[PDB]
Amino acid sequence: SPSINVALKAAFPSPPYLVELLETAASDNTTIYYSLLDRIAKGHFAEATTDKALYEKFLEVLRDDGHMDPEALSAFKLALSLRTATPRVEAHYQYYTATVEPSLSGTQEGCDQWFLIDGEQYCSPTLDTSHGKVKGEDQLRTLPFDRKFGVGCRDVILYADITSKSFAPFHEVAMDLAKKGKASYRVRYRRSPSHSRESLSVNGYGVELVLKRTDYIVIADIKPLEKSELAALGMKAASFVMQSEKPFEALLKLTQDFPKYSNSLGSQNVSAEFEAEHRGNREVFLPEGSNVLWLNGLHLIDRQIQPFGLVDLLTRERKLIKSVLDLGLTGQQAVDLLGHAEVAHAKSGDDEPRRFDWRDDIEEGQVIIWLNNLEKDKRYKSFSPSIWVLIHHFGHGLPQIRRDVFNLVVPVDLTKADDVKIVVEGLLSFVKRLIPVRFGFVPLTPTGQAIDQAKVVYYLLENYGLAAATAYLEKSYEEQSTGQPNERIFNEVIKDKSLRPDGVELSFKDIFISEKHEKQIHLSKHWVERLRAGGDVPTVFFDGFPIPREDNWLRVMNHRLMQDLQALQQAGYFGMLNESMWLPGFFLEKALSRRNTLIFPEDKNELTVLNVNKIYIENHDLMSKVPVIEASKESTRDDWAALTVVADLDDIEGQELVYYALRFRKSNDGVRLDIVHNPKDCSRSPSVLAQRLKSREDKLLDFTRFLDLETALETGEFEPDVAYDASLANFLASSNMKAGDNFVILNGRVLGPITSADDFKKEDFEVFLQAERRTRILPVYKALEDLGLDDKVSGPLSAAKLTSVTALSTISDLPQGIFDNAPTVRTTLFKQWNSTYTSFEVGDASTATIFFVAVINPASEIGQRWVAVLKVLSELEGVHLRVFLNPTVMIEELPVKRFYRYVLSSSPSFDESGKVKALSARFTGVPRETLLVVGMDVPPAWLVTSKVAVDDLDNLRIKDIKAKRGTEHVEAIYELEHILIEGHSREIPGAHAPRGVQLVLETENNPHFADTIIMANLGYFQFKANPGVYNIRLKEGRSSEIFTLESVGAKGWGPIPGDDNTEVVLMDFQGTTLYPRLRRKPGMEEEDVLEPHAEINIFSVASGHLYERMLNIMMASVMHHTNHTVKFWFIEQFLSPSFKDFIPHMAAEYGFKYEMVTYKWPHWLRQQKEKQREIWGYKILFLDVLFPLSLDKVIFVDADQIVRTDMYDLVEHPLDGAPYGFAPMCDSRVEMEGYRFWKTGYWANYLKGKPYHISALYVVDLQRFRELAAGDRLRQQYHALSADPNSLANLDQDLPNHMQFTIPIATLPQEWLWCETWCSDETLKDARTIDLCNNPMTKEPKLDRARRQVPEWTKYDEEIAELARRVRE
Ligand SMILES: *[C@@H]1O[C@H](CO)[C@@H](O[C@@H]2O[C@H](CO)[C@@H](O[C@@H]3O[C@H](CO[C@H]4O[C@H](CO)[C@@H](O)[C@H](O)[C@@H]4O[C@H]4O[C@H](CO)[C@@H](O)[C@H](O)[C@@H]4O[C@H]4O[C@H](CO)[C@@H](O)[C@H](O)[C@@H]4O)[C@@H](O)[C@H](O[C@H]4O[C@H](CO)[C@@H](O)[C@H](O)[C@@H]4O[C@H]4O[C@H](CO)[C@@H](O)[C@H](O)[C@@H]4O)[C@@H]3O)[C@H](O)[C@H]2NC(C)=O)[C@H](O)[C@H]1NC(C)=O
Ligand SMILES: *[C@@H]1O[C@H](CO)[C@@H](O[C@@H]2O[C@H](CO)[C@@H](O[C@@H]3O[C@H](CO)[C@@H](O)[C@H](O)[C@@H]3O)[C@H](O)[C@H]2NC(C)=O)[C@H](O)[C@H]1NC(C)=O
Ligand SMILES: *[C@@H]1O[C@H](CO)[C@@H](O[C@@H]2O[C@H](CO)[C@@H](O[C@@H]3O[C@H](CO)[C@@H](O)[C@H](O)[C@@H]3O)[C@H](O)[C@H]2NC(C)=O)[C@H](O)[C@H]1NC(C)=O
Ligand SMILES: *[C@@H]1O[C@H](CO)[C@@H](O)[C@H](O)[C@H]1NC(C)=O
Ligand SMILES: *[C@@H]1O[C@H](CO)[C@@H](O)[C@H](O)[C@H]1NC(C)=O
Ligand SMILES: [Tb+3]
Ligand SMILES: [Tb+3]
Ligand SMILES: [Tb+3]
């Protein structure tokens, strides 16, 4: 049969199989890593010579040593097929090659392996002699691919080539050294010269064969087009499978070659429509023809449905479920609990407000400057100071009283006129009106002028009084109308208002009081900071209730004022209140001193939870020797909770925090407490202080005073349990905790690091339990009981396992608001659906840990990929899958227009010689007469281009290849040239996308690997790179002038501890996803966009052998026509390898330079299913980011074009401050008018007076383009317009024309373009360049126009033709 074979290979050589197997096996469990490292250092894996034998040996070992069970072994095989660990090993090599070798000066001979201790290299295990002092930049920085074994003050690193036997003795020297406790052990890799430099063959991608002619509709030669009765295709296709009775295989066989089976459907009483019944299924949940996947309730987006994305999900999910099923729950019961209604409700219901302590007490009464006092003002003197005034009657206005009950504190900036106006007009009227509210205001101090004016007003209050200070403010607003202190205005106030300033005497003239400037201003700053009452939008506090200063905040205030009054009334009727009481303190009962703090973060996503069962399984050695206070024997399930405190007992804050936890435990009988001592200094063993407390464990919480706890720590003589020390440092590494840092863990949730123990007091534990209890514990308890699993909770630790697992289930791997429509809410509404005639299951439900629910539409192209991947994941043991087929009756056009193959295996395949088999996409029995297009359906982080192919992948036909090459078999090889580093930026603290910011990617070898600019949409940016250690620096210039980037969010959205870094490392086939943070430098509202290679640069794109042949002619015409230097730029992925291999020969002959450029289409940006449309988008959407920043300007020339001009003239053409220049449509042809569609309603109404331009030739002043941020506007307008499919006929032409109102377009002389179709023959004498624009009444081909229209076209073609033969010979 005539076949097509496609294979993909990586841009880095294949690492040794041995090292790949220990990396795949030990994902991040270090115990399995070093336990296997021992085995190979024995010389145990030396007797296995072939990859198959080596692989075979690992299976026996893992099973025998208890590392893996059937479920985990099956998962290991699939991940090993995927070759997931290969980029992780290459990271070591790139790091070693670029940072180790240039920092290790000297002559290396015999130093294959060497430890690095105190910046000294030792080539021998005996450690007697040191070769050198390794350069400055410290290699002791712990980075992503590192592993640590044991605890030790000294840090030792071994760079080894594991392959040879020379490794074994070196390892044992440091393994034992770590076992003793002298130093902590870690292994780094060295590129092994025993292995060959063969490239790596990859899998986990898909190949598509797209039909490029779909117009026809009314073994295989061509698909037979049938009369347009498309409507039943999905419905009949679904039945075919149900009938088969081997349904999974049928769907795969049908869905892969679907276009070929279209006419074969609808035959022999085909419908069998019993499943018209299952549209009762449609009537309750999903619309017809929609593809939806669930993994234990989790709704997955399309990006997560690849082999890599799915393997990582199972890994995380199993850890979660296994933890649950150790309490006697079936996998089925466990999943049902995770996706329960009460659980999802809690995530939705975690948005409630509270009150905060607005008082002066902390700042010793020197920050709030009140305009009122209702108890002593001689305005309210007439009114009654009675409680019953509030409680009784009241109309609709406000009840008058002489008492302190309602307060309002508003922070005001004295530099800003609008802010000052609020106090003078707003606040004062309320005073005069005798409103029963006390009005206060605190100045904001963000600038120098503001600081001074706070001093001025504060001083004026202190000696002279409120009215005098008031007077300065009033006068300043009307009289001077600016913030800055005015003495011309100030002195007038003192002139009259300076009468008898009582109390402490006046000082006058200049203020720099050590107390007044320092204490008052810094105390004010302490109040604003404490309650986060400043920034872009300040915060007003009414009765401790935050109301941001926006819109009509007084309307919001009045609503709470009435609601607080009704709250006082009800307490009065119950007799709670008395005449001797401070009424404002009724609200302050549950108020917190600090607003935000790690417990109630304003960023709702900021949260970290750990698997509790995991904590007591991995660290059993540690957690069975920690001081434990069991929760009371006679307490209720609702009262139950588990708390663990991590603290540095060698610091006051560390031991203070534990005293508060012990205090809290005395009060709450239901809590079960654990104490973990985490010290900063490793000189003394951590086990001693833990042993001191476990002896006093019985006597715990009998500490009348704090000293009793302090003394207990110091007394006693103990023997260091070094086994305890080892499990302790493993716990911190697993939990991402630094040494000497304080943390608090209630039911898995971590808060910290605690810098000061005053932040977390006994009262803070009580609210932490109260809120945590509500959100996580109560929804678990209800849901659990609803299922009848409430027998399985046997204690506080037993309960924490369940609540901690369900909290981890609702934390997304992908932060909300950046990818697509799929939140972190596990649904269960598909369980209601009837399943008899649309569903089929694979795997045992009783034993399965993983439950997949796929809802696939057979007529969809997306379904083709889904089926192929799901079949391979179904082959895994312990996985259950259930499939639902839902087709649509709405089919206006052909449903599937392509053939599909997925390259993926569930277990590795081996050679006749035992080597690992490479994987390929082989299509057999391909129709001989159909024209096809080859496409790669590659994971989102991948950048792929064709490397080996002699055929036109854009125009494939077997009949032509047979008649030209003699073979019916086509083979093509692609290269995974780059892997993406992509991220989503944000400004700090007022989080906005910093657009126009420039970035530079670097390595220790070269400081300029790559460069890109930040986009407006999601602060998006990307880099093309391979495995290794990189760094991101802001480009020198305006970017570094305005900003400083605190972090690149390499761990997650965060901020997570340990991420205050600018280092990026890629060690995965999923690339690197980043969430960087940038904070503006001192007092800036600046913008980059506004100011405070070769002589000629031409770029183009071609999508066929003909268009590439025409592109060769275009470049040659330029060269013959200019006495200048030219550089050509190409869109890399749309070109053939035949063209790619030819250009150096064109460059040598014609004397030009060339560079390949590309950018991957963003995930947020709207895709193009039609390749020709993709190409058009590449010319207009990514102009600012496709070319390096160093390029001033570029010119686009179409492939079909020919140029007779010296192209420099276009560069020198004045653009009059416009970012890009285009040439207009020809008017010169007299009788062509009918086909001039840009004089019709839509185009003439829109283009009022502006021209209709041509995208065949144009100039882009790139520096101005980026400066104007034109690209962002093009992209968002495209995305918005693209919702309607008939929006842009030719987007390349239509987008600049639709944006010429918004973005200026410089218009070019029409000498710059000629086209026979629209320009007269007389015009061509003065023509500079010629486009071969379409017919449009005829079908004459481009080859015909070229020879007839231009006589020198053949001369150029002959030159290329003989050179191609000259190269071939
Ligand atoms: C990451 O990588 C690792 C790589 O190895 C993966 O593999 C796992 O490794 C760990 C070690 O790192 C293995 O851990 C085993 O833990 C057992 C714990 O079981 C005890 O505790 C439970 C608590 O619920 C209890 O139910 C059990 O009965 C059992 O016992 C306790 O019971 C009481 C309650 O705790 C307690 O009062 C009692 O004193 C007793 O504790 C004793 O044993 C403790 C063992 O650590 C010891 O610390 C105590 O001081 C006390 O002596 C543990 O029992 C296992 O030890 C085995 O190890 C040898 C192999 O069997 C054997 O020589 C030992 O004698 C001991 O045998 C005991 O268990 C068997 C039954 O299994 C029994 O027949 C014997 O009579 C003995 O009681 C291990 O230390 C773990 O097993 C590895 N596999 C798995 C599948 O987890 C790890 O999985 C990777 N991570 C992930 C996420 O995959
Ligand atoms: C007026 O009303 C209050 C109601 O709030 C009456 O109760 C007493 O109020 C005081 C506070 O003003 C309470 O003191 C507090 O006690 C707790 C412990 O319960 C302690 O933690 C606090 O630090 C503070 O000391 C007091 O307990 C409370 N009850 C009694 C019996 O005094 C108050 O009695 C009323 N006034 C009169 C004179 O009746
Ligand atoms: C690229 O550069 C070359 C060199 O400057 C340009 O060549 C030009 O071609 C004309 C052909 O008639 C030259 O004229 C001849 O000069 C010789 C000098 O010995 C003389 O003997 C002949 O009788 C005749 O006059 C001319 O010198 C030369 N330079 C210029 C400036 O015209 C070539 O045209 C350039 N290409 C393009 C497209 O501009
Ligand atoms: C369809 O198949 C055969 C065709 O002859 C017929 O005997 C049978 O009754 C039909 N069944 C249905 C359900 O239409
Ligand atoms: C499922 O089928 C039964 C058949 O009796 C029907 O009563 C029920 O309403 C159906 N439910 C759905 C959701 O289709
Ligand atoms: Tb002491
Ligand atoms: Tb303290
Ligand atoms: Tb053209």
Residue numbers in the entry: 28 to 245, 279 to 1152, 1197 to 1473
Text from the published report:
The enzyme selectively reglucosylates a misfolded glycoprotein on one of its N-glycans and promotes its association with the ER lectins calnexin and calreticulin, thus mediating its ER retention. The full-length Chaetomium thermophilum UGGT (CtUGGT) crystal structures revealed four DsbA-like domains (TRXL1–4) arranged in a long arc, terminating in two β sandwiches (βS1 and βS2) tightly clasping the glucosyltransferase family 24 (GT24) domain (Roversi et al., 2017). Overall, UGGT's motions can be described in simple terms as two rigid groups of domains moving with respect to one another.
To probe the functional role of the “clamping” motion uncovered in the present analysis, we engineered four double-cysteine CtUGGT mutants, CtUGGTG178C/A786C, CtUGGTG177C/A786C, CtUGGTG179C/T742C, and CtUGGTS180C/T742C, all designed to form disulfide bridges across the TRXL1 and TRXL3 domains, clamping shut the cleft between them. The presence of the engineered disulfide bridges in the remaining three mutants was confirmed by mass spectrometry. We tested the in vitro activity of the three “clamped-shut” double Cys mutants (in addition to the activity of the wild type and the already published CtUGGTD611C/G1050C) on urea-misfolded bovine thyroglobulin. These observations point to the possibility that each misfolded glycoprotein substrate may depend to a different degree on a different subset of UGGT inter-domain conformational degrees of freedom.
